[PDB]
Amino acid sequence: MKYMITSKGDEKSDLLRLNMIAGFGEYDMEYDDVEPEIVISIGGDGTFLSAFHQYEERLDEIAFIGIHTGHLGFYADWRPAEADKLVKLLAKGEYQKVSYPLLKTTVKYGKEATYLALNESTVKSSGGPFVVDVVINDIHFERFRGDGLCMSTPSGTTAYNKSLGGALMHPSIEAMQLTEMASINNRVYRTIGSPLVFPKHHVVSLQPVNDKDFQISVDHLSILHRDVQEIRYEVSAKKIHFARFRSFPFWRRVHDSFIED
Amino acid sequence: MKYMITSKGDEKSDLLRLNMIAGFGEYDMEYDDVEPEIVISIGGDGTFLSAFHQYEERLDEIAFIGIHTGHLGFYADWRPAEADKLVKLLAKGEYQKVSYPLLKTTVKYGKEATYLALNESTVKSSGGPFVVDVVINDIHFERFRGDGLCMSTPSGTTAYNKSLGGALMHPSIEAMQLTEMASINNRVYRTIGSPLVFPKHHVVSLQPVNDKDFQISVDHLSILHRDVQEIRYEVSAKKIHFARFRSFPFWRRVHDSFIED
Amino acid sequence: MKYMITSKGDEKSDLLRLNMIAGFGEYDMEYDDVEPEIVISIGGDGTFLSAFHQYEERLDEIAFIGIHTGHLGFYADWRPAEADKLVKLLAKGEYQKVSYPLLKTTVKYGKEATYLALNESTVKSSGGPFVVDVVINDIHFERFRGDGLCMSTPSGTTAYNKSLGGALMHPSIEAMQLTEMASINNRVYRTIGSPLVFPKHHVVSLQPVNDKDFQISVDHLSILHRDVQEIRYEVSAKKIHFARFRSFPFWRRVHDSFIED
Amino acid sequence: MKYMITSKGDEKSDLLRLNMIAGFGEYDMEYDDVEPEIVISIGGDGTFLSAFHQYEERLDEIAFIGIHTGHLGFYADWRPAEADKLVKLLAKGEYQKVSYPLLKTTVKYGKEATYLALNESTVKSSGGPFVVDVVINDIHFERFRGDGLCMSTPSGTTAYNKSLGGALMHPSIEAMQLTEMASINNRVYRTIGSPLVFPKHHVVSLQPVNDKDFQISVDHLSILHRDVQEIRYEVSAKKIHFARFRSFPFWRRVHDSFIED
Ligand SMILES: C#CCCCN(CC#Cc1nc2c(N)ncnc2n1[C@@H]1O[C@H](CO)[C@@H](O)[C@H]1O)C[C@H]1O[C@@H](n2cnc3c(N)ncnc32)[C@H](O)[C@@H]1O
Ligand SMILES: C#CCCCN(CC#Cc1nc2c(N)ncnc2n1[C@@H]1O[C@H](CO)[C@@H](O)[C@H]1O)C[C@H]1O[C@@H](n2cnc3c(N)ncnc32)[C@H](O)[C@@H]1O
Ligand SMILES: C#CCCCN(CC#Cc1nc2c(N)ncnc2n1[C@@H]1O[C@H](CO)[C@@H](O)[C@H]1O)C[C@H]1O[C@@H](n2cnc3c(N)ncnc32)[C@H](O)[C@@H]1O
Ligand SMILES: C#CCCCN(CC#Cc1nc2c(N)ncnc2n1[C@@H]1O[C@H](CO)[C@@H](O)[C@H]1O)C[C@H]1O[C@@H](n2cnc3c(N)ncnc32)[C@H](O)[C@@H]1O
């Protein structure tokens, strides 16, 4: 079927891509970066994140594969030595697909713009003070004053969420996790402090208090948004599909990345 | 139907219990502490935890209610003023039931003994050094050296899990969360540090290295177990059922207990 | 002697200032905002921080007083009701002075600019990735990748340092404390994680790796500095002097601000 | 002069000790384990901690040396290969001494018993609930409910204090640091949470509320104390003296032990 390959750009990934294309030329596999059914990312987790957002509007018709030319990634969990074994099994097909939940972010103006995140979405202050009211399912939960907030997907919990003290969540759990960035807690201000894990259909809303200008990041893309009235977080109805060929469990991936390999 | 009421023992809870029994005498509600279908706990979360373990073998035939005579609890979320409104709606029936996940703990010897936890189960050292190998689904994940480990239910995440840095999980999520107690991390020893959230059917196993004697707590019951070869944690197939009469969402319960009421 | 008074600008602080000036007119106390020997700050800790930096070049010839018109501050620890008792004892003199350590920050270019901080100095990334080599007394200690670093004075440990997990230090200790902001820790990157407390004459140096542009804050003043080759932190030889009239210990100030008053 | 050597007991340390004694026999150095002026510890930090408490009543007349036969320690910072270079310079003398602060613990009954700690002293509950009132310089600061409290020396901050989130303190600072163990924080109970660093002459007192029985550890020695009315912590007037032969700075020792060597 149709396939494409993204590269980190260095010599190692660029030439691994040209070799896989050549091996794909020995099967009925046509290169198409417009309507691919298989997207192969060669590089790191950042290169994989770029590939996800490249084809975020065809998520249901695409299976993703990650090849790490440097260290082991959580999305790029295939070694370069397995590339030739990869093209053969990609060609035959009959592979299984695994799906991970995604995070939907809605940003309102005084108009709405929505985004999809594979790792997390964060809201941070321009430079001045960051105060936001946190509303959970139309109920005011807290008034946060600090550096920012981070809402993570399950597969994103090993990323930014982890450095903020969040828990690591197995990706079969359809949930999202909110973490704080340097919360002020004294006589006037009071936050929960602990990370929060929300199920499906739960809507977490961030609302401004004085300043209505902040930086909003979705994965690796920080966007300054003006005249923002609301930021809505909920588990997306859409999912990312991975091409599954071997057993590499999430907890073994966590062990290899953080304990030792 | 059949019902019983447990009391914390102080004058306030003891006499609130006698008044509810009297009001129950005005309906076809018989007092039975052997085979009750409704268990009312008057006191605190500790009094509710006692009531759960009193009837842990009839969980599927019982609906629990908690009345807090002191501060607001997470299980005792009914105020004493609503007691007379409680007996009437308890009598008519037609109420809804909500269910929270539980944690199953299996302890092996060189024989097996299993327990059910509503808050958490913890493993801690006698006094000497605590080393355990942590195995996740038959894969060795880490060698923990520290004070202990805590495996929490969703509704237990606001308890011991919270004080150990764990995340707060909505109880509709069928999961368990593992947290560390003062982990040694240097050149020799290495743990994940972050809390871990496991889905159903995932089995977390704790295995001894040198000392085979530790204290194992299940909710409020610390048991010294000897010749222990394994401690197995997984989300239980059993659930606790609450009598639902009004809307008191979990996040509002979290807000009132920790932010301010 | 010579004195001046800064105000937060609201009606409460502005009119408390005019009343203290009037009461000062009944003594041999001349108002001089050029060469004052007594600087009175009416407002909050932010108003006091502004007053410190207003007269940072005459620190050795000035005694500071803070009056909080809102909640209790750590520098503004005098209540408005004590203002008339304040002017009398300010007039007679014979008061004692207490001194708190300060933090010196040196920023080098490819030229040097130095600053004095009463709370802390932080280095953060523009928007892109933040990597800095941390050198302690000319020895490379770690390569930090994350959101930023915070170096706090003793009296600043209850501020930004506290929200980043740092320890609270009694101000009689001539030291500085470094804390991390969301450190990446995996197979490639590795930081100490724990806060670090340095004595006098110890020099902590931050050095760039790729990007040489960051935001550098000194108290409430965030400055974008370009072509930065080094940022040097050490306990300053200069000290801030407070006019001491009553006993308000630091730990009681901590208790009232964070436990409850 | 007079000297002695303690060994961990394994073959490596036992035979390194016999070789150093033989090399010492070639100088005017007499072996005396009753009144030694030089105490050499061969093993780990635990073996060094044992040697400190062996001679805690002659601290002012003794210089300590640590040799690590396993991994690098913070007190045993000499490699076994340097043992022959050690005996020569130990024999000539003319070496310098460095001193680290110690922690004094006083335990009162209804009588007083005092102890000296090189790492830390901790107070923990038997099994039941742990509540203690924390008094700082005769002022009630907080009512702690949790697992326990840890008061660390500067050189102990890389040990138990570190695993509890405490800051790492350079040993030239005459101070002590208090850290919490799993504090309960809700509507009823409230602790500072942050670690606390106290200077000299500051007295931190722990006082019971209901239960008067707890476990009190001083370094590696956990002692169950009954009928305890008070536990008093303050920086000791006594200091431990190390034989200084080379430059191995504390921060390099921290780097090698935790970052990588
Ligand atoms: C410029 C620029 C940004 C580089 C591009 N960058 C791609 C990625 C990634 C990634 N994804 C995962 C994952 N799912 N699980 C585990 N590790 C993961 N990483 C690793 O993450 C490191 C930094 O990139 C790399 O080793 C990479 O293998 C963006 C991602 O960076 C993460 N992030 C941002 N700030 C912080 C912070 N203070 N602390 C921790 N993580 C942070 C945010 O998550 C943001 O989606
Ligand atoms: C003696 C004795 C034990 C008293 C009986 N105790 C009953 C309970 C409870 C409870 N359950 C919940 C819940 N589900 N959510 C939120 N708060 C909850 N609490 C509150 O918890 C406080 C202490 O009891 C009380 O305010 C109570 O309203 C047992 C429970 O105590 C918890 N626990 C034990 N050690 C710690 C610790 N270091 N830090 C934090 N929590 C701890 C363990 O969880 C253990 O299941
Ligand atoms: C716009 C704008 C900034 C407002 C002006 N702001 C003046 C002050 C102050 C102050 N000084 C102390 C002190 N010494 N001890 C204890 N509380 C103290 N505060 C309290 O601090 C709160 C925020 O201002 C107020 O309640 C105030 O009573 C600057 C100071 O803010 C602190 N800071 C900045 N970001 C964070 C953060 N994420 N988390 C925690 N603190 C932070 C940095 O420290 C920076 O010096
Ligand atoms: C049985 C038994 C106890 C073994 C004997 N043990 C001797 C020592 C030591 C030592 N001293 C220092 C130091 N000064 N700096 C840095 N690392 C240091 N260690 C290292 O410490 C590890 C465990 O021993 C070893 O790798 C050792 O090289 C006692 C010391 O253990 C420390 N401790 C106790 N519980 C915890 C805990 N939950 N987390 C962290 N540390 C803990 C308490 O501190 C108590 O003084």
Task: Provide a short characterization of the protein structure.
Chain A is of the alpha+beta class and 261 residues long. The first copy, chain A, is 18% helix and 42% strand. Chain A folds into two domains: 1-101 and 238-260, Probable inorganic polyphosphate/atp-NAD kinase, domain 1 (Rossmann fold); 102-237, Sandwich (Tumour Suppressor Smad4).
Give the biggest sheet of chain A: 11 strands, antiparallel
| CATH topology (fold) name of the largest domain in chain A | Tumour Suppressor Smad4
Query: For the largest interface in this structure, which chains are involved and how many residues does each contribute?
Result: A-B, 34 and 34 residues
Number of domains of chain A: 2
Return the structural class of chain A: alpha+beta
Assigned CATH architecture of the largest domain in chain A: Sandwich
Q: Please state the CA-atom Rg of chain A, rounded to the nearest Å.
A: 20 Å
Could you estimate the helical fraction of the residues of chain A in percent? 10-25%
How many angstroms separate the termini of chain A?
35 Å
Beta strands of chain A, count: 16
Instruction: Provide the succession of SSEs of chain A.
Output: EHEEHEHEEEEEHEEEEEEEH
CATH classification class of the largest domain in chain A: Mainly Beta
